[PDB]
Structures are given as C-alpha cells and as structure tokens.
A paper describes a structure:
p97, also known as valosin-containing protein, is an essential cytosolic AAA+ (ATPases associated with diverse cellular activities) hexamer that unfolds substrate polypeptides to support protein homeostasis and macromolecular disassembly. p97 forms homohexamers that enclose a central channel through which substrates are translocated and unfolded; each protomer consists of two AAA+ ATPase domains (D1 and D2), an N-terminal domain (NTD) and an unstructured C-terminal tail. UBXD1 contains three conserved p97 interaction motifs: a VCP-interacting motif (VIM) helix and ubiquitin regulatory X (UBX) domain, which canonically interact with the NTD, and a PUB domain (peptide:N-glycanase and UBA-containing or UBX-containing proteins) that interacts with the C-terminal tail. Here we identify UBXD1 as a potent p97 ATPase inhibitor and report structures of intact human p97–UBXD1 complexes that reveal extensive UBXD1 contacts across p97 and an asymmetric remodeling of the hexamer.
In p97–UBXD1open, a single UBXD1 is similarly bound but the interface between P1 and P6 is separated by ~8 Å relative to p97–UBXD1closed, creating an open-ring arrangement of the p97 hexamer. The open state features a modest right-handed spiral with an overall elevation change of 7 Å, largely owing to a 9° downward rotation of P1. In addition to movements between protomers, there is a notable rotation between the small and large subdomains of D2 in protomer P1 in both states. This rotation is particularly evident in the open state, in which the small subdomain is rotated upward by 10° relative to p97ADP. In the open state, the D1 and D2 domains are separated by 8 Å and 11 Å, respectively. These changes remodel the nucleotide-binding pockets of P1 by displacing the arginine fingers from P6, probably precluding ATP hydrolysis in P1. However, the p97 open ring is observed only in the singly bound UBXD1 configuration, indicating that this conformation is driven by binding of one UBXD1. Strikingly, the remaining 25% are in the open state with a singly bound UBXD1, indicating that under substoichiometric conditions, UBXD1 binds predominantly as one per hexamer in the ring-open conformation. These data further support the functional significance of the open conformation, wherein binding by one UBXD1 through multiple interactions breaks the p97 interprotomer interface and opens the hexamer ring. An open state was not present in the dataset, indicating that this conformation may require a post-hydrolysis ADP state of p97.
Author numbering:
A (entry chain F): 23 to 499, 509 to 707, 728 to 763
B (entry chain G): 121 to 441
Write the structure that this text describes.
C-alpha cells in the first residue's frame, strides 16, 4: 500500500515526479505538494508531485536524477510519504562534482546554481545530487550542508553558498552523463521491443533461475549505421545495471590466430563472472563473416567459436548477447538458427518526428537563440540518421564558438563559466551546418507516416468512408487485406493511400513504377520479398504498389512481346502476398491506369479483393479541390472558385492543381517585379485558365467505364 | 463540496442543490405567485438560451396589449403560435407566470378552423391598469437562475512533523510473481498496441476514457510563516476569485502579493483565466510570496514578517496528521 513501481519520466525536470490522479486522491496530496520517496539502502529523496494523462495507475514517473538519488532503477518499488511540514531553507551549501568541473572555471553560482534555484522553490535534501545544464556542459552538484534538516525548500531569501574544492565522486555514485533511455530519440517502438525481451531476465533473474525456462539468448539489431544500435544496447545495460562488455569485429580480427579466439571466449567468461551482463558484438558481419565469402582459416574458426559460445549461454545464466549488423543477410546464416540470434529488430531511419527529438537530445546542454527552429531543421534533414544529427548540432555549435571566440580572445586551460553562458547557437549556425552535413543514409529507403490527410483530397466522400471501414472493421469486429484503385489518372489514387495511412498513424511504403521496372530489367525480382519484409517490420503500415502495369507497358502495353499479362516481378508479388496474414497490420493498396493489361491474378481472392473506381470529380468536388489546393496561399476575395469549377468540367484533380499553381507562379512574379500583389487575384486565375487543359479525354473515360461494367 | 441554498439557508451537497431550490420555488407560490413563476422559468430550465428567448417573446406579448389596450385582437395570446410553441411552450414555468400576472387559459373558436384553439386572455382587472404588467415584464426580464452558493470553507492548517515519520517493512522491496507477470503482460500489450493498424476513431474510443472525472477543486497555499491556507472553488472559477480569497485570509488584505502555481507559472490576478485551464484542478498547492517592493521596506525597517494570516482565522487552526 502507498507504494508504486518506478517508471520513466515525461517531465525532464529534476525536482518533480508524476503520479496518476487516482493515487494522489488516495494519498490525499495535491498537485505541487512536497513528498518524500523511500528507496533502497534506507535512502530518501524529496520532490514535488504532479499528475498527467499518461502515468499508469500503479506507477510513479521519475527521471534519472531522482532514481539515482534513491539508488533505484526502472521496475523497482518505492514508498511515497507526504511531508507538508517541509519549511523554507535559510542557508544551503552546494559544491560541484569534480568529474564535471574540468576545463571550466569562474563563478559557477551565477551561471548554474542561481538561475536553477531562483524562484524555483525546489525541495532539497542533504546529500542530493542534481544536474544543471548550460554552456555546452552538464555540471552536477552535491548538497553538503543545510541549515534546516534534513530537507527544505529553497526560497528567494535562501542563502546559496559554494566554497571549497570540487567533490570527488563516491564509488557508489554514477555519473549523470552516462547513456540512458532519455538519450534515445526516434525508434521508440524498437526500444520497447528490446525492453520486453531483455529487462525481464536482468531485473527479475529469479523467474528464470528457479525454473527450466530460458530467456532469449541474443538479439540482432540491424539497420543503417548511426541509427542507435549501440546506443540502445548501452542504454539498456546502464538502466538495468547489467555489466556491459563491448566487443567488435576489428578488435578480434586484428589479432593473430589463437589470440583472436582467446579474447572472444575470455569476454564470455567474464560476462558470466559479472552476471547479469550484456555482451554487445558490433560489426557482426566482420567478426563472423559468411563462410562462403572467406578463404582464411581464422575467419572460419572464429565463426565456429562464436557459435559454440552462443550455445554455452544455456549455462551462463543471466548473460544476454546482442549484436549489430547492417542487414540480416550480411552475416553467416548459422548465427540465425533456433536460439543464438533468432530474434532481430529493424531500427530503420528516424522520421521527421524522431529527427526533431534527436536534435532536442543533442541540444540538452546547448543555449539556443530565439530564432532557432529545430522542427524546421528536422523537416529538411531528410535521409539523416542520429549520427548525422549529432554532427549537425556539433558543427552548429563550433560555428557559434568561432564567431565569439575570435572576439573573446581567451587563451588558457579553462573557460570562465560566464563566457560559455553568453554563447548561443542561432539559426544561421544551423543553416551553415546543414550545408556542410551530408547524410549517411541517403540511399536507403525512408519509410514514415505520410503528411497527406483527408482535408487534402477533394470529393470522393464515399471512397474515404470505404477505406476507413476496410481498416477499422478487422479491429472493431477472412477480411480483405488490400484494394486496387483504377480509373482516370490525376484523381487522387496516391493521395487516398497516403491519407488512410496518415489518419491511422501508419507507415507508408511507396513503390513506384521505376522500382518495379528496375527489378524486372535487372532480373532481380527476388527483391520483392525485401519489400514485403519491410512492410512487416514497419507495421502498422500501408504497402502501396503504384503503376502495377508499368512492366506490362514496358513489354509493349498496346503492342506486346512474347509473354502475357504476368511477369517475373508481379509473380514474386503474388507469391509474397499469399504469405501475409490479415493480422500482420499491413494494408496493401495498388493502383493502375490500364486495368486491361494487369495480371488478373492480383484480383483473385485473398489479394486485392476490393476494387474502387475513382472517376473525374464532379462540380462540387472540383470546388473542394480548388479550395484544398489554395489552403496554403492568400487568395483575393474577387477569386470565384465555383465559377472556375463550373468551366473545368473535364478536368482532373491534377489539372485543377495546375491552374492553382499557375496562378501562384504569376502572383509571385508580379510581387518580385514590383519589389525590384500580396495575394492571388482573379487576373492570375483567368490567365492560368487560358493554358490549363484536361489531361483525360472522353474516350479514355469510356475505356474505364466499360471495364467497370465488365467486372461489375 | 457544500453549498448554501439562497431561498432557505440550508446546507446542501452538490447533488441536493436542485431538489431544495426547486421545492423552495414551488412553495414560494403561496406568497408571490409571479416571483415564484419567474424563479421557476429561469431555475428549472437548464437551457438558458431558450429561457432568454422565451421571456423576450413573453415581454413582446405584454407590450403588444400595452400599445393597443382598447383592441381585443391583442388581448389573446395563441398557445399554438409558431413563436410561442418554440420559445415559450418548451420551457417549464411559463404557463404559471401567465396565470400569475392575470392571463386566463381559455378555448376560443379559430378564425379558419372548427376546432377551438388555446389562448391566454388578459382579464379586465389587469387590463384596466397596464402598470401591473409593465412591472411584471421587468421582474421576469431582469431575473436570473437560482443556484446554491458554493461554501469556500476557509480553513488554515498546521503541518505536523509526525505526518512524515514512517519506516518501511524489511520485505517492502521484495516484489512478487504476480507483480512481475502484470508488468511483463503490460510490456507485451504495449508492443502489440504499437503494432496494431487502426483508424483515428478507434484510437479516440480508448483515449477519451480519461476525460470526465472532475468539476470542483480544492486549493492550498503555502505561506512563509509555516501555515497552510485551504479553500473550495468551482473548476471553472477565475483566478481573480483565488486572489480575493487569499486577501480576505491575510492579516493585511491590501498588501500586494503573488501566487505561484505548482507548474512554475505565476497566476495573474487581472487575467480572466479559469482554474481548469491553468492546471489547478482537481487540486493544487500555490506558493505565497509578498511583492518585492514591500519586502524591501519591511526588511529595511527591521520588521520581521512573522504573521501572514489574520488572527480571526488562525484562532481556529487545525493540525495535520
Ligand atoms: N536513435 C537515436 N537517438 C539518439 N541519438 C542517436 C540515435 N542514433 C544515433 N544517435 C547518436 O549517434 C551516435 C551513435 O554512435 P555509436 O555510439 O557508434 O552508435 P551506432 O554507430 O551503433 O549508431 C551517438 O552520439 C548517439 O547519441
Ligand atoms: N481528389 C483530389 N483532390 C485534390 N487534389 C488532387 C485530387 N486528385 C489529384 N489531385 C492533385 O493532383 C496531384 C497528383 O495526385 P496523385 O494522387 O499523385 O495522382 P496519381 O495518383 O494519379 O499519381 C496532387 O498533387 C493533387 O494536388
């Protein structure tokens, strides 16, 4: 009773914890009340309690600084004891930790302690360690004396003292700058999967020691370099307390025969002695390359040695081995057999949201100017991984440093804290760094949730509902797992597939004609399996195969070669679809502009069983299309969009967009010419109307109508 | 939460408010039928926008006969009129008001139908003196719904050091198999929820489950002198009512001060912001501090500010346990 399980914080502040409101009501404490937390080794910490909409009813959310003061870790239990008697302090003596005050000097109070405590009313207890960030440094302090005891609230009238040599860290105290879970940005889902597999046997070893059931023996982390494969492995070890042993290919391969295998098996022996422990083997493809790809005896032996050491994990209780690779197929398949590394996680490439969070992590200690917009940066840094965003922030810092240091002229071993305090990184420094940074993951496919929403699609009210029913039905109540779109081009086929992914917060995988043609021309149709494998790893996702007839057209379309409607690539797609279940949370969508030449197999039961016709928009839809296209621009009141819609009777949605974009182009030119008008006027639309034409003829519409009536 | 009924003086709970006020209004008909029906129209009907339209349409019928008191065409108000049916007939207490101010409910032949229609017809006794209806019109239009007044229940408490004295059992930190299975099941369910492909409507059905618990709040204020000041507010109450509450509790109600919220945001007395908008609901502690201008003069003069609250409240201070 009155005890909760320790969970991760949402509010990063070091003086506050968050409870679920029902427990604050049972404990009869209010938001902002000061409470004590009772941890292990008869230690306690004092903090303020708030609440949010995400904390579990039976958990307490506290950050790393609070957990370390209590000597507790995620998954442990602490007691909550309100202490309304806490009084305001009169004098508190705070000294920094020596491990973080190196290379920095000057008045630390004015830079760190003063703004940290000033009007903050943070509870403080003697012996507390807390972290104050700023000046591109993370400096933590320990409280050595309090006039009231054993805790108090700092007030504006409280004397803050700081005199004496920095404190040497105690052997039982961990540094607050170590890697933890709060240093991982995107790929939260993948981290959650690792937690499920790894934290249990390490935090609760008795569950597997008392019985014959073994935990997972190893996890293979794969994806582009710089995405957090090693960051996750280190964060998990540091948060759970398991001993972390670092191994990598080059370290073992650089050794001579005998020494190499000895070092590999020695690390495994040390992990058992220091169990619980995690062994992280980086560059798995380098230490254990495919046998058929090497001729040396050393490489063949080291693979056999690793295979035997992994099997020995049945006796090495509480030792888990993790490894990193670029791709699951870059390593000797023996490691991926039942046991060993039979479980793998796809880290992928951070999306726009993840990239923003990664930037915010690297700026924890950075002073930003008011003009800095990290969301705008995250949107522009397409193809970048966390390793590149780390370099991006560092380069922006270095540019800001050079600009000021040229005028500061401070040549010494240390920098006065006030000098760093006044240094800020502005948008011109991130803009410069962006021009110098080059993404390391530009060739790999980037899969994320699309930004196209239902408000961007004019008309098609019934198709929108149909797609929502197809995705919602298997969740609210063999259901179909895919739909083919057919009809005139430029009416929203792609937008519909993206919009349903958007609303579901599902990943969107876009396969275009050139990709299907590349596989066909290069006789590499086997790569289709990799596409479907990504769809599984990306789940929930929408797997969109555009231009399904691109190959049929490449083979003649209207004339034709020696084959039929089927080809090498569609045959692989048809085969792979048969292996995907409705419970994989993957919705497959196709599109074609020439159904008369599509392999009919794709519409056979179990595949793209749904078939939706997307006609040219009617009058009310064309008005909606024009309004949607212009939602991002100023439009004058004299622009009659309904009049335009009445004239553009044969226009597709894409053709109405050309009119809007032409009017935008004309408005821009006029504004530029006047400067060397601020809104799009009717004259700009009337001029655009003189050039825009319908792209789909009446004969092409009849072709689609006849097909629709042929299938019914 | 406790309230006082303005028509009886009784102490009520949040659920007992309508039952006591409605009864007092229905009994009031024995003293002043017009005043009782006016309270009934505004108090019984929850939809105040319709009440405002109803009483405005009634006021027009009364002014119509006032303009042409000698013409029989303005003496009868048809209960089946489109405007009467929508604005007046839909409200409870409007028929009682008409009877109270001299209108009789009768059936008259229609100008184009055999079936008699319902009319409110003004009697000669009241028609002879239009001043009576003119006063009754103003009494209805100037009225408000009757609601029980929220009792602030102003209290001051003295925290006791004994409240935080607790020692844990030796086996406190020894977690059970049932606690481990629940946590591992929540981990497996969290990964599964992240994997599910579902629409926004299905997401809302789950998220929306946390939105309806509270409509009142209890606020506490931590004072420099070690006293805790507490009181009760509506969740929609404005921050200006909290500053007024504290000013009344202070020994010197005129001495400028600030109230700092639990999230680090200072509360502005002159800002029309609700407690459920600034994050002080269902409950919160505020930090009290005097304005710096007066603190400089108080300290410079050698005066220790050792009393924050008025002796009138401190004489009733309760200890916390
Ligand atoms: N997903 C991520 N979130 C946060 N930081 C990341 C992420 N991925 C990479 N980084 C950053 O990039 C660097 C990763 O370098 P390293 O430790 O060699 O790991 P790896 O090469 O396995 O990605 C670190 O500075 C880390 O903070
Ligand atoms: N229904 C629609 N509503 C709004 N805009 C549309 C619509 N259909 C097409 N467009 C416009 O046409 C452009 C191309 O749409 P897209 O879906 O890519 O066509 P397709 O699927 O034929 O390649 C979009 O940028 C959009 O502005």
């Amino acid at each position: 009773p009155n005890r909760l399980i320790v969970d991760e914080a949402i509010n990063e502040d070091n003086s506050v914890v968050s409870l679920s409101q029902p427990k604050m009501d049972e404990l009869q404490l209010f938001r902002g009340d000061t409470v004590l937390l009772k941890g292990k080794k008869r230690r306690e910490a004092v903090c303020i309690v708030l609440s949010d909409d995400t904390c579990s009813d039976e958990k307490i959310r506290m950050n790393r600084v609070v957990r370390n003061n209590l000597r507790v870790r995620l998954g442990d239990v602490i007691s909550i004891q309100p202490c309304p008697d806490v009084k305001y302090g009169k004098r508190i003596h705070v000294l920094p930790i020596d491990d973080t005050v190196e290379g920095i000097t000057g008045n630390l109070f004015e830079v760190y302690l003063k703004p940290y405590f000033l009007e903050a009313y943070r509870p403080i207890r003697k012996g507390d360690i807390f972290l104050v960030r700023g000046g591109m440094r993370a400096v933590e302090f320990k409280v050595v004396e309090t006039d009231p005891s054993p805790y108090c609230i700092v007030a504006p009238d409280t004397v803050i003292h700081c005199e004496g040599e920095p404190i040497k860290r105690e052997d039982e105290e961990e540094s607050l700058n170590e890697v933890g879970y709060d240093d991982i940005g995107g790929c939260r889902k993948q981290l959650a999967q690792i937690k499920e597999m790894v934290e249990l046997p390490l935090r609760h070893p008795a569950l597997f020691k008392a019985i014959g059931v073994k935990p997972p023996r190893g996890i293979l982390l794969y994806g582009p370099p710089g995405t957090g494969k090693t960051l996750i492995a280190r964060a998990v070890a540091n948060e759970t307390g398991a001993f972390f042993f670092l191994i990598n290919g080059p370290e073992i391969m650089s050794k001579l025969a005998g020494e190499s295998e000895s070092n590999l098996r020695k690390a495994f022996e040390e992990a058992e002695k220091n169990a619980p422990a995690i062994i992280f083997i980086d560059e798995l493809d380098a230490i254990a390359p495919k046998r058929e790809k090497t001729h040396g005896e050393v490489e063949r032996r080291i693979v056999s040695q690793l295979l035997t050491l992994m099997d020995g994990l049945k006796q090495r209780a509480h030792v888990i081995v993790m490894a990193a690779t670029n791709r699951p197929n870059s390593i000797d398949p023996a490691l991926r057999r039942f046991g060993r590394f039979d479980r793998e996680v796809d880290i992928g490439i951070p999306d726009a949201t993840g990239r923003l969070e990664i930037l915010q992590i690297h700026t924890k200690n950075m002073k930003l100017a008011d003009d800095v917009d990290l969301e705008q940066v995250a949107n522009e840094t397409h193809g970048h991984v966390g390793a590149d965003l780390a370099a991006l922030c560092s380069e922006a810092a270095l540019q800001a440093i050079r600009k000021k240091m040229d005028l500061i002229d401070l040549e010494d071993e240390t920098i006065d804290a006030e000098v760093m305090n006044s240094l800020a990184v502005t948008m011109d420094d991130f803009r410069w760094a962006l021009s110098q940074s080059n993404p390391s993951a530009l060739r790999e496919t980037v899969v994320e949730v699309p930004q196209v929403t239902w408000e961007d699609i004019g008309g098609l009210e019934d198709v929108k509902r149909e797609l929502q029913e197809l995705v919602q039905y298997p969740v609210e109540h063999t259901p179909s797992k895919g739909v083919l779109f057919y009809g005139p081009p430029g009416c929203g086929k792609t937008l519909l597939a993206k919009a349903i992914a958007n609303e579901c917060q599902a990943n969107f995988i876009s396969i275009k004609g050139p990709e299907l043609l590349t596989m066909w021309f290069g006789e590499s149709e086997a790569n289709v399996r990799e596409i479907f494998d990504k769809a599984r790893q990306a789940a929930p996702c929408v797997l969109f195969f555009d231009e399904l007839d691109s190959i049929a057209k490449a083979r003649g379309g209207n004339i034709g070669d020696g084959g039929g409607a089927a080809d090498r690539v569609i045959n692989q797609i048809l085969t792979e679809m048969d292996g995907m279940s409705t419970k994989k949370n993957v919705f497959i969508i196709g599109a074609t502009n020439r159904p008369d030449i599509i392999d009919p197999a794709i519409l056979r039961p179990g595949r793209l069983d749904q078939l939706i016709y997307i006609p040219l928009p009617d009058e009310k839809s064309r008005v909606a299309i024009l309004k949607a296209n212009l939602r991002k621009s100023p439009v004058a009141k004299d622009v009659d969009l309904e009049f335009l819609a009445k004239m553009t009777n044969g226009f597709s949605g894409a053709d109405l967009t050309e009119i809007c974009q032409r009017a935008c182009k004309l408005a821009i030119r006029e504004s530029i010419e006047s400067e060397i008008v601020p809104e799009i006027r009717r004259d700009h639309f009337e001029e655009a109307m003189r050039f825009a034409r319908r792209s789909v003829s009446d004969n092409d519409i009849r072709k689609y109508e006849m097909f629709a009536q042929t299938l019914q | 939460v406790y309230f006082t009924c303005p028509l009886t003086g009784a102490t009520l709970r949040k659920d007992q408010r309508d039952a006591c006020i409605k009864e007092a209004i229905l009994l009031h008909f024995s003293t002043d039928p017009v005043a009782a029906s006016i309270m009934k129209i505004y108090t019984f009907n929850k939809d105040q926008d319709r009440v405002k339209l109803g009483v405005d349409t009634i006021a027009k019928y009364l002014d119509n006969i006032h303009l042409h008191p000698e013409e029989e065409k303005y003496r009868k108000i048809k209960l089946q009129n489109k405007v009467f049916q929508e604005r007046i007939n839909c409200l409870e207490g409007t028929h009682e008001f008409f009877e109270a101010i001299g209108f009789q409910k009768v059936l008259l032949p229609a100008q184009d139908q055999e079936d008699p229609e319902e009319f409110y017809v003004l009697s000669e006794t009241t028609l002879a003196q239009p001043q009576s209806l003119e006063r009754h019109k103003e009494q209805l239009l100037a009225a408000e719904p009757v609601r029980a007044k929220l009792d602030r229940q102003r209290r001051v408490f003295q925290p006791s050091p004994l409240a935080s004295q607790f020692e844990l059992p030796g086996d406190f930190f020894n977690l059970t198999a049932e606690e481990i299975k629940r946590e591992q099941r929540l981990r497996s369910e969290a990964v599964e929820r992240l994997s599910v492909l579902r629409t926004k409507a299905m997401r809302e059905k789950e998220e929306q489950r946390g939105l309806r618990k509270y409509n009142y709040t209890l606020l506490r204020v931590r004072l420099p002198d070690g006293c805790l000041l507490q009181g009760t507010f509506y969740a929609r109450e404005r921050l200006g009512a909290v500053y007024g509450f504290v000013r009344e509790a202070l020994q010197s109600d005129w001495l400028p001060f600030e109230l700092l919220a639990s999230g680090g945001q200072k509360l502005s007395e002159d800002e029309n912001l609700a407690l459920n908008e600034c994050g002080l609901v269902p409950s919160a502690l505020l930090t009290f501090s005097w304005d710096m201008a007066v603190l400089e003069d108080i300290k410079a003069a050698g005066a220790e500010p050792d009393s924050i609250l008025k002796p009138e409240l401190l004489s009733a201070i309760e200890k916390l346990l």
